[PDB]
Design a protein around this ligand. Structure first.
Ligand SMILES: [Mg+2]
Ligand SMILES: [Mg+2]
Ligand SMILES: [Mg+2]
Ligand SMILES: [Mg+2]
Ligand SMILES: [Mg+2]
Ligand SMILES: [Mg+2]
Ligand SMILES: [Mg+2]
Ligand SMILES: [Mg+2]
Ligand SMILES: [Mg+2]
Ligand SMILES: [Mg+2]
Ligand SMILES: [Mg+2]
Ligand SMILES: [Mg+2]
Ligand SMILES: [Mg+2]
Ligand SMILES: [Mg+2]
Ligand SMILES: [Mg+2]
Ligand SMILES: [Mg+2]
Ligand SMILES: [Mg+2]
Ligand SMILES: [Mg+2]
Ligand SMILES: [Mg+2]
Ligand SMILES: [Zn+2]
Lengths: 99, 49, 137, 122, 97, 56, 86, 58
RNA sequence: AGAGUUAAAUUAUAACUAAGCUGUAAAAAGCCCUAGUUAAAAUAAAAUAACCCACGAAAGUGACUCUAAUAAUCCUGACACACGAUAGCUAGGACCCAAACUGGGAUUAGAUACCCCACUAUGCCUAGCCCUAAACCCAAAUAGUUACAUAACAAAACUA
């Protein structure tokens, strides 16, 4: 049997380390009129704006490239016992699985 | 080391003999302490103009 | 078309002229805009008073001269006398914060004076003389 | 250098400036102070019209004299310079090189203050 | 018994702290050109921390140096010297919009 | 009252070798004449502790 | 007074535009805080009132900055809901 | 940035004299203030002045 | 705590111009030895920096320079000793400005109040007193804990 610590040590998320400026392939699972919900796969899904070029090439299930900025947007404010999670990650759109 | 360093600077001190020469050379060698700074934190000296 | 809002100090060598005269020789217009009155005095560069006009000098009254229309009229009244002595450009120096602050400045243009610059010389003490006590005890 | 005099001499001719500097340095030496260096910062325009010795001064020559003096002779030199009609505004300060530069660590991220109020439901 | 357990070590991804524009510098009262970069060109007001962006020590040192220079007679109080008006902008305040 | 001479060669430069061979300018600079009140306080403290105490 | 004139708080008009130059000068004064200081110095304020005003202004500034920060943080969630009707 | 709040309020753990004395607790509410309506002012005053300038002279 | 200095404003003081200036929601009174610009000593206070939170036991302190200097190898502890914001007293000095009181002008049935004007003690320096404050951060000092546990509000509940 394999232990949770052993698998977590070799997990790709552990290998990534910090989530600042990391290239991640994410697959879009939901489509809005102008917003794309890209699931980079870590914890949450990031919402991005459809670019002007190759706009029709972004469909459901399409895999794209992102530069991850924040794994989860949480912040504290005045008189807050806990943080206010946004249930979303921050990332930018660069390309769509160049190959 | 402090004493040794101060011995070197004791040679260039202004005395009675060197008063006339020091005043004349100061009146002919102007000095400026002006220097600006940049957003990146780099020192720029206006002496290039 | 590189234009700078900073004044043309005499220490520089820039070539800016108004009606053939340099920025230093252009006459001055001191506009003291108080809370109850607005006074305008147009003087030459040599500090020689050329024209003088206040809201009270135009036949107004106690509360009448404190409005912006009184300052606008006083601007035209001062501009007419300034033009009568041959003045085409003037540097406006504003003194004090009052209701007739911009009104006099625009009244000068209405009366026929071309403003090249607006200087705000408002007396702000560095915690000097103690002002009067507050109202509505 | 221990003390630094920021001498502001009246804008005059070269021989007069030299004589004024000579007598000022002699006065500094008479008080029991050895002079390290004298640097001329040049004759500039005064930021404001300084009125001194019943005279309105618009220009002036800047000089910087660094020296070592006892703590008791500072006011005596200040008094001597106050009565000199060729000095616009004399000032003796501590030399900036005496204070060693401290490690500017930078901005330390200060977290927002919590637990300032009770957890009672509003 | 487990070797893959995490070890209580210091964070290797510790990003260095940001430095002020004058971090590890020497603030002086005679470099009026340097001192003028933090004052308002129109009124001579000293800009605050939210404008200058200097970590605590240097803001106070700049304020003290400016106050010393303005009374010693090296830098004007009412306005900024136009000779230093062309200095590069380090402040984060924009007047003309 | 104690009378520390102005040329006492304060303790910060007193216990170093080759201090008496230096010139009068450096000796005067390192002496108590150019020193503040703190150096005289240190000199008086050491002088009193050397003569009153048994284990300085 | 002792300083040189026509240097401080002076703006040069452009192409005869005076109303805009006056607005520029007013913005200069407002950003430098001179308008508020002039309006405050008309009548003397006691130190207790000055301290109360400073504390109130600091608290208001803190609250406004935090509210603006939260609004900017939550601006993302203003998009149309993709799971309507679930 | 946000002004510092450490050591400002009067608390048992704070050893120094309090700096800020809030009128109301510094708790971020769940609703922003309503936009205030601008106060109106008289208009066309400068044009009424030049209109009456005709009458005063004619 | 001493010694020295003044950037802005204001004023005693002169010159040119002009007739009002100041005054409020509106007026009246007052000054027209008035108002604006240009120069200007002395006194008082110390814009922005300060969205900083430091120093001091507290009161209190943030215009600049210099000297002296901020106890305790650090528990609590008086009726004992030393300080003690503003206000007031005594003697000497200064007095730009503000202002108790006062005298006028408004409003009111009345206004010995709020509003405007002028001015005094006083606020300013030295010495000597007086020893009071919502002197409150209404939370005693010394070393601690987040265990049990919300009368209510407020700055959470507690140990030796
Ligand atoms: Mg009351
Ligand atoms: Mg303390
Ligand atoms: Mg309350
Ligand atoms: Mg004293
Ligand atoms: Mg002055
Ligand atoms: Mg007098
Ligand atoms: Mg009357
Ligand atoms: Mg000040
Ligand atoms: Mg101690
Ligand atoms: Mg005890
Ligand atoms: Mg008293
Ligand atoms: Mg009096
Ligand atoms: Mg009065
Ligand atoms: Mg009465
Ligand atoms: Mg007392
Ligand atoms: Mg108190
Ligand atoms: Mg009590
Ligand atoms: Mg006790
Ligand atoms: Mg209940
Ligand atoms: Zn720094």
């Amino acid at each position: 049997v394999e232990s949770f610590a052993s698998m977590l040590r070799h997990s790709p998320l552990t290998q990534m380390g910090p989530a600042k400026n990391k290239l991640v392939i994410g697959q879009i699972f939901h489509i809005v009129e102008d917003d794309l919900y890209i699931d980079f796969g870590g914890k949450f899904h990031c919402v991005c704006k459809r670019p002007e070029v190759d706009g029709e090439k972004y469909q459901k299930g399409t895999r794209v490239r992102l530069r991850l900025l924040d794994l989860e947007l949480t912040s504290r404010f005045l008189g807050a016992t806990t943080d206010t999670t946004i249930l979303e990650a921050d990332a930018v759109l660069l390309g769509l699985q160049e190959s | 080391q402090e004493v040794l360093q101060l011995q070197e600077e004791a040679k260039t001190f202004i005395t009675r003999e060197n008063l006339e020469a020091r005043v004349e050379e100061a009146l002919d060698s102007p000095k400026s302490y002006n220097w600006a700074i940049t957003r990146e934190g780099l020192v720029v000296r206006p002496q290039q103009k | 078309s590189s234009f700078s809002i900073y004044p043309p100090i005499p220490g520089q060598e820039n070539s800016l002229r108004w009606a053939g005269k340099k920025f230093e020789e252009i006459p001055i217009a001191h506009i003291k805009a108080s809370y109850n009155n607005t006074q305008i005095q147009v003087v030459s560069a040599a500090h020689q008073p050329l024209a003088h006009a206040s809201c009270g000098t135009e036949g107004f009254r106690n509360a009448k001269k404190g409005t912006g229309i009184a300052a606008q009229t006083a601007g035209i009244a001062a501009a007419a006398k300034a033009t009568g002595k041959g003045v085409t450009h003037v540097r406006v120096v504003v003194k004090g914060l009052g209701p007739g602050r911009l009104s006099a400045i625009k009244g000068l243009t209405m009366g026929g004076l071309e403003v090249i610059s607006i200087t705000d010389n408002t007396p702000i003490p560095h915690n000097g003389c103690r002002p009067r006590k507050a109202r509505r005890l | 250098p221990r003390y630094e005099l920021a001498l502001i001499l009246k804008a005059m001719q070269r021989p007069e400036t030299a004589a004024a500097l000579k007598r000022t340095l002699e006065a500094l030496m008479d008080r029991g102070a050895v002079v390290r260096n004298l640097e001329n910062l040049g004759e500039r325009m005064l930021p404001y019209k300084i009125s001194a010795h019943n005279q309105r001064h618009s220009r002036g020559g800047y000089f910087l004299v660094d020296f070592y003096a006892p703590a008791t002779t500072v006011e005596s030199m200040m008094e001597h310079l106050s009565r000199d009609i060729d000095v616009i505004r004399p000032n003796i300060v501590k030399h900036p090189l005496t204070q060693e530069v401290k490690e500017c660590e930078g901005i330390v991220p200060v977290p927002l203050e919590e637990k300032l109020y009770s957890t009672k439901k509003r | 018994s487990n070797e893959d357990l995490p070890v209580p070590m210091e964070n290797p991804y510790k990003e260095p702290l940001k430095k002020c524009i004058l971090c590890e510098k020497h603030v002086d009262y005679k470099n009026v050109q340097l001192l003028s970069q933090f004052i308002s060109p129109f009124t001579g007001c000293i800009y605050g921390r939210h404008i200058t962006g200097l970590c605590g020590k240097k803001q106070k040192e700049i304020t003290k140096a400016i106050k010393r220079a303005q009374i010693l007679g090296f830098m004007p109080v009412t306005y900024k010297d136009p000779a230093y008006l062309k200095d590069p902008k380090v402040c984060n305040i924009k007047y003309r919009e | 009252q104690d009378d520390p001479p102005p040329s006492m060669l304060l303790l910060d430069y007193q216990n170093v070798p080759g201090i008496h061979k230096v010139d009068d300018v450096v000796k005067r600079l390192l002496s108590l004449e150019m020193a503040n009140q703190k150096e005289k306080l240190k000199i008086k403290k050491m002088q009193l502790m050397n003569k009153v105490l048994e284990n300085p | 007074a002792n300083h040189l004139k026509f240097i401080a708080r002076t703006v040069m008009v452009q192409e005869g535009n005076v109303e805009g130059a006056y607005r520029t000068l007013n913005r200069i004064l407002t950003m430098d805080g001179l308008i508020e200081d002039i309006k405050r110095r008309r009548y003397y304020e006691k130190p207790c009132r000055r301290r109360q005003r400073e504390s109130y202004e600091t608290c208001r500034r803190i609250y406004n900055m935090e509210m603006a920060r939260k609004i900017n943080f939550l601006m993302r969630k203003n998009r149309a809901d993709p799971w309507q009707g679930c | 940035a946000t002004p510092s709040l450490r050591g400002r309020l009067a608390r048992l753990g704070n050893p120094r004299r309090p700096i800020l004395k809030p009128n109301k607790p510094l708790i971020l509410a769940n609703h922003v203030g309503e936009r205030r309506r601008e106060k109106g002012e008289a208009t066309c005053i400068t044009e009424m002045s030049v209109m009456m300038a005709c009458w005063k002279q004619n």
